[PDB]
Amino acid sequence: ALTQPASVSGSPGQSITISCTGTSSDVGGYNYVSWYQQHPGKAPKLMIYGVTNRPSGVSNRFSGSKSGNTASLTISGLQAGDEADYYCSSYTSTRTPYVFGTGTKVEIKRTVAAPSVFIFPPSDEQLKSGTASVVCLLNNFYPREAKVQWKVDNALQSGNSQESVTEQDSKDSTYSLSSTLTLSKADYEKHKVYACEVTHQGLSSPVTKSFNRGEC
Amino acid sequence: QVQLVESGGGLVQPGGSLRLSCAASGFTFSSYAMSWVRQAPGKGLEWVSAISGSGGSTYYADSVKGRFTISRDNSKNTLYLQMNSLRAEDTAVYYCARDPGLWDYYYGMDVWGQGTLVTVSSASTKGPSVFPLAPSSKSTSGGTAALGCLVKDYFPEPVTVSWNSGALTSSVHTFPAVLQSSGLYSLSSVVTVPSSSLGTQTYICNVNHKPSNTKVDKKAEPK
Numbered sequence: 001a002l003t004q005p006a007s008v009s010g011s012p013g014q015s016i017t018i019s020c021t022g023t024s025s026d027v028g029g030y031n032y033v034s035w036y037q038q039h040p041g042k043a044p045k046l047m048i049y050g051v052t053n054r055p056s057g058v059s060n061r062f063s064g065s066k067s068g069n070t071a072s073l074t075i076s077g078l079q080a081g082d083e084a085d086y087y088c089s090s091y092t093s094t095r096t097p098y099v100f101g102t103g104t105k106v107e108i109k110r111t112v113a114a115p116s117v118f119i120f121p122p123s124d125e126q127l128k129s130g131t132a133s134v135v136c137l138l139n140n141f142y143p144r145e146a147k148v149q150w151k152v153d154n155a156l157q158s159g160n161s162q163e164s165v166t167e168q169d170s171k172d173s174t175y176s177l178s179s180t181l182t183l184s185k186a187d188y189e190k191h192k193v194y195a196c197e198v199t200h201q202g203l204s205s206p207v208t209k210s211f212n213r214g215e216c
Numbered sequence: 217q218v219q220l221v222e223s224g225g226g227l228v229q230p231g232g233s234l235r236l237s238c239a240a241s242g243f244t245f246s247s248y249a250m251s252w253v254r255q256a257p258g259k260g261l262e263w264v265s266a267i268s269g270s271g272g273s274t275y276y277a278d279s280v281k282g283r284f285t286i287s288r289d290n291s292k293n294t295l296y297l298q299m300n301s302l303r304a305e306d307t308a309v310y311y312c313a314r315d316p317g318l319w320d321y322y323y324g325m326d327v328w329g330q331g332t333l334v335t336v337s338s339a340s341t342k343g344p345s346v347f348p349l350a351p352s353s354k355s356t357s358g359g360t361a362a363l364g365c366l367v368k369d370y371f372p373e374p375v376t377v378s379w380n381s382g383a384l385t386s387s388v389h390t391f392p393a394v395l396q397s398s399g400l401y402s403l404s405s406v407v408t409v410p411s412s413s414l415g416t417q418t419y420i421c422n423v424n425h426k427p428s429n430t431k432v433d434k435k436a437e438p439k
């Protein structure tokens with residue numbers, strides 16, 4: 001596709017710019033570059049067509065341009081809600097009639113916010129199935145970087161967990177993370193203490209949350 | 217009432233076939249090139265095919281040319297991606313979209329439908345089991361409590377989770393599904409709420425995995 005940076009970040013009120021690098025047969029030689037904004041889980045929205053044109057209704061905070069073989073989207077006065085993926089596209093004089101760029105994720109910078117952390121035991125319901133899931137929630141932290149590891153009876157766990165992170169929140173610009181520990185009921189029942197230890201910028205040292213299996 | 221409503225997505229076996237539909241309303245469908253764009257899970261938009269307003273010129277991407285065919289109906293206002301010979305790598309959300317260029321093209325798609333998931337896999341539908349993540353006294357956050365539901369072992373995507381039938385939305389995090397080495401997806405949906413509310417408000421997640429006719433409401437509660 002058309003070359004875009006993987007990611008662009010700035011603070012609210014900044015102006016940031018996303019480039020889109022093509023060739024003389026597309027972005028460089030013709031004035032049919034478009035830009036789309038796509039929020040997590042929604043359809044893209046047309047922000048700019050014909051290099052510089054904004055469809056009626058699109059905020060004048062978004063402007064398009066190009067120089068040589070590179071088009072740029074400039075978003076002025078960055079908002080929290082401006083977090084999204086952005087795609088350019090171009091007509092090409094080649095067999096290719098139309099192509100998209102590789103897309104850029106816009107991250108809004110904000111103050112450091114330590115995760116609030118929670119641990120959940122497997123449900124009584126679930127154990128009857130011969131498997132236990134223990135979940136650790138890291139809520140509303142910033143920056144994105146986190147580490148979470150599992151300790152059962154104090155022994156660091158390897159290879160029995162998966163993590164999922166949310167997209168940057170549109171209002172508070174934070175992230176949340178789940179860490180899920182999967183054990184056989186059998187293995188689960190033959191240990192007592194279950195702990196999630198979180199490491200994050202906004203926290204002096206690790207925060208641990210645990211419970212004891214069979215504790216109230 | 218300007219809109220494009222898609223249908224026909226689903227879980228389809230490899231080498232298999234599928235026909236997608238895209239029903240147009242609120243505009244003169246014949247007057248506009250319409251287009252199919254797809255996005256594989258986590259990936260970018262890939263232009264797949266396009267067709268002239270009249271159908272007389274339909275146009276297609278490389279990666280798809282062999283086995284896909286775009287087509288259209290201006291009385292039924294409907295675009296089709298009869299999609300045949302499907303492979304796993306055509307697994308994506310498929311969108312249709314309008315170029316609003318009336319006498320000329322924008323090279324820009326303005327009106328978009330909502331998307332349809334196409335999953336090309338030889339695995340079969342499997343509904344989730346739903347377990348509470350109960351508010352728990354081993355992390356009692358002064359003023360804020362967390363609880364949730366674990367939605368484990370389903371296929372294909374997607375699953376939807378809401379809380380108290382849509383009443384509770386602020387403070388909800390429904391995490392992106394992750395594929396287990398079991399080949400099944402799993403996710404949790406959580407919510408933070410005042411500790412004080414655990415004694416005054418009941419919390420029930422409503423999970424719906426339409427592909428498997430699995431509907432489930434689970435209460436997430438203390439002790």
Ligand SMILES: C[C@]12CC[C@H]3[C@@H](CCC4=CC(=O)CC[C@@]43C)[C@@H]1CC[C@@H]2O
Nearest residue numbers: 097098249251266275315321323324325
């Ligand atoms: C629809 C479209 C403008 C019209 C394009 C289409 C790509 C292929 C194409 C080839 C042609 O020769 C005529 C115009 C069309 C049909 C483009 C894809 C997106 C863009 O908006």
